[PDB]
From a paper:
Glutathione (GSH) S-transferases (GSTs, EC 2.5.1.18) are cytosolic enzymes that are present in both prokaryotes and eukaryotes. GSH conjugation is essential for the detoxification of xenobiotics. Previously, we identified a novel GST obtained from B. mori (bmGSTu2). We also found that bmGSTu2 was capable of metabolising diazinon.
Residue numbers in the entry:
A (entry chain B): 1 to 116, 123 to 209
B (entry chain A): 1 to 115, 124 to 210
């Protein structure tokens, strides 16, 4: 496992990359970055990721940051035929969209509230993000975020939603989200264990 | 049948999708969304994009929002062999990274300022410094390769908003050369950016 992932134990983007690597059976070495000590802020770390954020992948000297791009690369390079990242352009676009939607909106709004500051408008924006994902699940009428099977689009949304559970936020009125999120735990308990370990830390 | 793009005349994500469609010679119908009238906030618009943001693509009933995903889709669907979006996993990852970097960081920091505080100004310079760093390490003429890719358009249009406010970024040697070389090598594509720049300047 010469593939190296620099990650943090309670960070949803890190968890998503680990779940994908585990689901794809791609061996890797995990480096727990010492966030409290500022390890991601050193020049050595910036040699790998000039953005100074976690995670970053080192694939035989190829340094790749941005967890969405890391998710896409692990599939494209090591499992190009896997349904975890379909090759059909339309099906692939739904996955790509859901990845962008998590980065641009869903995780952005949810984490602003589940971290640090909790305001009426922040609470409203959590509900708007849930409403939009609920809307997407209603329109596709799929069991998972981008298809009727698990894809890399699921992991970032799962780990964003996990932070709501971490603060005992009730989102059960979002029927399809609640079912999708809980079905994930039952169908993929090994992958959920990665989210659950972080959830207990965030708690 | 013709693609339909719902866009706004002064929005960098809209401009990037138009440049890609034009570069790939994919024909489309342009719908200029009436932002001032709130057209992107109606229920009919939300049928296409529940996020209520611009742009959104309608490809014969397939509704796709998020400009980065739209860029990837038009390449994957209509020009899979194009060097504008390489198929080699590593080369593709550099493109994908640069798209994410624009969305998460470069456009986020630059637009917060060009649309002003000491910390916001510092964050503009950090974003420029990071992109300057990436260009130095790849030693490439463009953002992800020695040829134009879809990664270039979002970064070009983020950088255009600095020019729109007369922000001097010439200290960033490689960014300045890359940006100005784009205008000279691709004048038709730059005309799309320039028309918005004149609106933003007003």
């Amino acid at each position: 496992m010469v593939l190296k992932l620099y990650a943090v134990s309670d960070g949803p983007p890190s968890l998503s990359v680990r779940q994908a690597l585990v689901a794809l059976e791609v061996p890797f070495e995990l480096i727990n970055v010492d966030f409290g000590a500022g390890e991601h802020m050193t020049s050595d770390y910036a040699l790998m990721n000039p953005q100074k954020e976690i995670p970053v992948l080192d694939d035989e000297g190829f340094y790749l940051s941005e967890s969405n791009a890391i998710l896409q690369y692990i599939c494209d390079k090591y499992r190009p035929g896997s349904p975890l990242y379909p090759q059909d352009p339309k099906s692939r676009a739904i996955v790509n969209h859901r990845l962008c939607f998590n980065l641009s909106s869903y995780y952005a709004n949810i984490s602003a509230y589940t971290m640090a500051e909790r305001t009426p408008l922040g609470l409203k924006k959590v509900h708007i993000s849930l409403d939009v994902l609920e809307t997407y699940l209603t329109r596709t009428n799929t069991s998972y975020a981008a298809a009727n099977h698990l894809t890399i689009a699921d992991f970032p949304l799962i780990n964003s939603t996990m932070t709501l559970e971490a603060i005992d936020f009730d989102f059960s009125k979002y029927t399809k989200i609640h079912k999708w999120y809980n079905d994930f735990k039952v169908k993929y308990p090994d992958l959920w264990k990665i989210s659950e370990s972080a959830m207990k830390e965030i708690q």
